[PDB]
Symmetry: D2
Subunit: 477 residues, 4 copies
């Protein structure tokens, strides 16, 4: 049984779910151009699937919300697509001035049709009694701010995305403008979704097929540097027009030791993948170039933490430092077993709900900021594992709360199937199955399980047995 004010819901992204219905196409993002690029397709960097054939949330949002209401959900996290509001070009970053006159000038350039359509979507959302977390950014940038093919080719004379402080400046003004327009509907804000993935896969993990796909340690650091300032300036921008909480959403793994001699490798991995980022935007502690400092304009720019989680990462100590191991966590075979004997998803991700308890309690002990679980889900078209995955991870959230961690909601990824970036439509995370020909939504049995949890605010006695590992013997291994 969960606290009275705890809410169960779902998370969703604009680029992944909006398109699919007539009139919904948004061609003005780096991601849109990226997945249509002939060379990216021939290299197998992208799947060949196109987002304009997606589930059609732009047109069918009422049907989405009907199903969420029947499922007993009480909270939703969505984002607005920057490119839809500002499709056309507009004429250290320690401050970005925000004032009424600047906002009114921005208003003259905004696409009012897209603005009003979002208002209709969000009004319908609130009319179902759903608590609303509005996220400003979930990866695609306006084309006038980032041509990713040019950067992929090694040409840095054009719009270069997060490599340019121009993007930092415009993002802060975008965030302030959206809050200025939508504060009456919003309950809590998030500046961005998983900035570590944008910088990490965009400039280091280039086999993932994320834009701009230019391999460079140095440019990865610059992108993360600029995105950190962009968060702080967006925080100040939102606070200049709103008094509501402002947080951030971040991708996490539970770092686990291979042997009992690897506990120091775990702490190194947590520093390098987690603590360095949040120490910057909470405590102001960052390193600029080759020097460590404390920036006052970064300190204290966070009210809550969005915890995304889906699997662990196993590490061991080396002489040079630490390394992560294949065959566990993120790097398993699809629809198989890990080296630890645990089942893997359609994406090759290892079943490990204990990791969610680890991540929540560690965030709480270090910063004592309240949290939402803003992402937890599994790629599972057949729905073989998702019932166990759902109940097990919800149980671990209950465990974290009992330990004293202030966790206020669980948001599953996702309500319905959607476009999974470079992997296309074949990775299906939905509680609801999408038929992309008819756009009809279907209830997987795990959706019936989730309705039991959400309507009762607890893991009921009837479904407690699903707090367990999916039996491996009947699965492929």
């Amino acid at each position: 049984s969960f606290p009275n004010s705890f809410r169960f819901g779902w998370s969703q992204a604009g680029f992944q779910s909006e398109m699919g219905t007539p009139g919904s196409e948004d061609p003005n993002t780096d991601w849109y151009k990226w997945v249509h690029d002939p060379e990216n397709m021939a290299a197998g960097l992208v799947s060949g699937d196109l987002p304009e054939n997606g589930p059609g949330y732009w047109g069918n949002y009422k049907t989405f919300h009907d199903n969420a209401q029947k499922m007993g959900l009480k909270i939703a996290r969505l984002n607005v697509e920057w490119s839809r509001i500002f499709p056309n070009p507009l004429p250290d970053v320690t401050e970005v001035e925000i004032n009424e006159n600047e906002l009114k000038r921005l208003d003259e350039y905004a696409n009012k049709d897209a603005l009003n359509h979002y208002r209709e979507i969000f009004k319908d959302l609130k009319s179902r009694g759903l608590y609303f977390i509005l996220n400003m950014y979930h990866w695609p940038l306006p084309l006038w701010l980032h041509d990713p093919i040019r950067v992929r080719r090694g040409d840095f004379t054009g719009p270069s995305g997060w490599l340019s402080t121009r993007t930092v400046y415009e993002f802060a003004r975008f965030s302030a403008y959206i809050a200025w327009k939508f504060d009456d509907l919003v309950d809590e804000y998030s500046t961005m979704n998983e900035p570590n993935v944008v910088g990490g896969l965009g400039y280091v993990g280039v086999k993932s097929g994320f834009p701009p796909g230019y391999l460079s340690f140095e440019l990865s650091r610059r992108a993360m540097y600029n995105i950190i300032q962009a968060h702080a300036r967006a925080y100040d921008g939102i606070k200049s027009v709103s008094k509501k909480p402002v947080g951030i959403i971040y991708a996490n793994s539970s770092f686990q030791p291979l042997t009992d001699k690897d506990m120091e490798a775990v702490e190194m991995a947590e520093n390098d993948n987690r603590w360095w980022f949040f120490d910057a935007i909470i405590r102001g502690e960052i390193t600029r170039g080759n020097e460590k400092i404390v920036r006052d304009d970064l300190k204290g720019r966070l009210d809550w933490i969005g915890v995304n989680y889906y699997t662990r990462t196993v590490v061991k100590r080396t002489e040079k430092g630490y390394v992560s191991l294949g065959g566990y966590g993120h790097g398993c075979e699809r629809n198989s077993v890990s080296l630890a004997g645990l089942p893997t998803s359609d994406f090759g991700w290892e079943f490990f709900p204990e990791g969610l308890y680890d991540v929540l309690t560690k965030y709480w002990n270090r910063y004592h900021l309240y949290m939402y679980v803003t992402y937890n889900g599994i790629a599972d078209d057949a729905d073989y594992q998702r019932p166990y995955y759902l109940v097990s991870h919800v149980y671990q959230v209950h465990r974290a709360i009992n330990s004293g961690a202030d966790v206020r909601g669980y948001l599953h990824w996702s309500l319905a199937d959607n476009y999974e970036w470079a992997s296309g439509f074949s990775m299906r995370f939905g509680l609801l199955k999408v038929d992309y020909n008819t756009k009809r939504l279907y209830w997987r049995p795990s959706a019936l399980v989730y309705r039991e949890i959400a309507t009762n605010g607890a893991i009921t006695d009837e479904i407690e047995h699903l707090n367990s590992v999916p039996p491996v013997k009947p699965l492929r291994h």
Copy 2:
């Protein structure tokens, strides 16, 4: 969408589900002695699991019925255990020649029923009444079956027969069992008619005779390998049905049917359609032509017995998989790697997934069996068994919705089908296989006897409360994806 009077429910057996609570043990059956036998255990004929450690329906029936009511179910099929009502030997009848091959009449009258009452176990009788009263109070339509395999020990010592000794109580090899079963069936209807909606005489008699005397590796009693004695057992069980039908009708006006195990016989190639008809004759039509039309074979002669004709009001269709056959020169043969004879948790030679029991996914077979019964006899039917051994619940959601869809299809073709009864509500003791084969919509923890809802149970609630496969769950009318399953 199903007819207004169509009912969704479940089927259950006494020996498999009753025991598990203190004082519920029934040690007075051939099956109880059979699964406790040291030699059977050492041979691996039986699993070593014991039914007295089961799900405890005898004591916990209210909890069973609570969950069925929450699930929206509206019909139930159960049986009474003969051994519980009459645990002790009854005296030999005065005028009854046990060397006579045919039992054409068993006299039933008020005084005979009263004499039987003096030997009945009143504790068991009153307890069943309480169980059935609680069942009816939940709005459940009640099909009462008289027999679901175990016989009283005083009528069958199966260890003696296994050893080749036929001088003791020999079960369905003796016409004494035929005589006593007819009187048992009449007695139960005499006692319970106020609670019963429809009757069944017995469950799957073809499995009792077939596995008991031919398929002896299955570990069914008495496990004596003999073609001839298999035929004699089936001959007596046919007369026992006819005499039980007449016995029940002498005290009741309610419908009396029978429950029978079926496969859908399918041709390997398009050249094997005659092998299908042969298999249907030898495994299905011969039995029902006997109890409906009176047409039987006695010894080496084919006849028409007036005392067998017309002894059936409805047909209980049990189904779970197909059987693939091909023509030979000698006749026909059934093929391994399909239907009943697959590897467990794998795929068949046709690429279809198999259950924990090694049974192939083939819902089309249910349409085949229902329509063929209808076209031949035009008697209305209940689907009295459909289920899958699936502890993890990976396949059961697809299995449930796909087969329910095929029932809807059969009704559209004109077949009079009045209910679908899933096997089963909760896990139970699966005969020689023990507790490891789990058929329940509800998972049973045998240590605590607690019941848990598998997701397929939530799916069934959607079906039952809506009386239809809703739009939301139509996608489950499909084959479980084989790629993520074990091959």
Copy 3:
């Protein structure tokens, strides 16, 4: 490297390999009638395969011997079929009198065609330089001594096989007669093959489909009692016409403890499955009423021990005694992995070569009689595991010799595929693959490996890597 006199070869059975060529059919055994029985076929007790469609050693023995010679083999163990020599009825057991006149009377009833044919086979065998171990009995009995269908049905008024002392009496005379006729060709004798399997599967493990398939603890004990005396009387019978060594061949498992608290269960299992039998025929010791009584007519009736081995048996202690565990050893799934992570064969038998060292050294320490490994092989049509199985077990024999055990040969089961009893032809144990349509023999790669071992008398450097477990990841799980 093995001792100079150590010999590599193969073992073979008459019923399994002889038939298949024109004129080779032997219909006069309990086993022949058993596998043709309509009721046994319908119950699935027997496979439906018929031995008269077998590999045809009766007609093609020269081809068998050609391949064995090319493979460098130096020893062979075969048996004569009692039923072939005496197909027709002839008109405590502490003594069976053998004398010249009795043998001459027996000679008048013997089938001379079959006798001369065996002589031609064994002469050709010896002409290849093969050391010859002749076994008298390898399970089928003459029909006039055992009608197994009658016993299966519970009728004990007919010929009842090893339940009747008539079989004991006639077997001793058969054994003496064969040694009388063939001593010039034989190097060493064995009385019988695996009598524990005959009694155990015939009367307890009746799902195995072995004759007569009558489930009875008591009759199982009587069969073993009679078969023990039959060995002793056959030993005395052979020694009355020959001075050559006489041993016995016995089926073994390596009994292994589940946990370190189960070592007493191992000793109990070894007592009940191994030591009770050999203490009887070596030391004369049998137990009668909680006392160790000693029969003089059984003592000292053994010159060597034939060690058959293919897998382990895992046991644990109960309060009542001990029990063996499924998922290990004999009781695994086919073409899978055991609960210990070890691969299993086409028969479901676990890979455990260490067990052969355990069994050899334990026999040696208790009795100090020299041994031959008279059976070691695997059901493996594809030949995926047999190369590892062969080299690993041969290495364990080398280990046993280094420990001091007198082991004088390794005899693989088998040279070529053959009829595997109730399982029929589908279980293929051969170093050579048999095409049962053409009767052609093919060399599996493990046969090429065995030639390297046999011709060099050692596991060469080139193939040492096969002393390892077959990699499990590429195999079926």
Copy 4:
């Protein structure tokens, strides 16, 4: 049974096998720098394994050749590493315009060769001479290949190109590389003609250009994604072959061929036969029509260059699996789940087993490729590559015998095929995948550098010493049973 002069042997590469003993390291190649690059390692473009920990052929070549002789092999194809002979930059040529697109002639004469000799590493040169002398002393026919992917660092800095900087040494994007490769090839033939039987200019140039500039997830250098630069690289590599052919012929009269990577293009359905023809044009025929008939497209439109025509004496056919294609409206597409793109240690969508690399078992394709090359050009062939990644040796015995059988079938059809060279004699460094992909008939222990005979090596000895697939091993001409394998 094969023709009297047919030879069984193996193929091998310098970068993959030479290093592993102290002092054998060659750090002066684009490939060496590429696999040591920290950013490539962090991206997972390369495995992290390093070639200097390899099987040690540079020092232990006699042990390799001893085992090959024991195996009955009679032919070997090896290459010299350009970087070992010329580790230092050569001065810019006096009369050569690098902006000119076409290299139609490279002058070779005695005085120019003697000047080149002044820059060559004589120790490395003599060591290769000792390796090849040992090879010939065992009766092995010798095919010398000039190029097997790594370029001298002074001709190609691949990290610079990966970053989008084209102001440095740019490999096959520069005609400087074309000019120097022709002189390298003529120089090597000048030095080794007495030991060589037949020449090859290069190994799989389609993979160098295709994976280097299009298939960049493969981790091949320089990994710069560009259709246009892929075309320029292939254009330059074609001229480099023609100029190398002419360079070798100016000092030798022996045959000069080329080695090329092939797939058998197969139609998904019977409606996809035109997609097969398109795939063969775009991946095979365009290249060989250029270097045999002189037919090429320069920039926009098509021509016939006399300086390219007739520059080939024989064709090296590399093969390991098929590619399944289907018709689209735009053209054709290749399908995952078949051929190159299957799961590792599994089954394809057609039910055929896959290797440690995820490559589908399809020996019939080798017959398809050999006969099609023969019918189009009527130049004799060697099978210069055929093998499987298989550490456990489960599939290689079937793979070996099946593909050898298909070569025999191609010869019976009239194709002039003169040898079969398995990949490879021993395990080696498999480029971006590192050491985990093991192709050897002999297994390598990389700690001790000891070689072990897998059973397939004993099978190959039977084939080679008898010059035929003997009756004893004919059953291996079949698909590995999938049921006992992981699937």
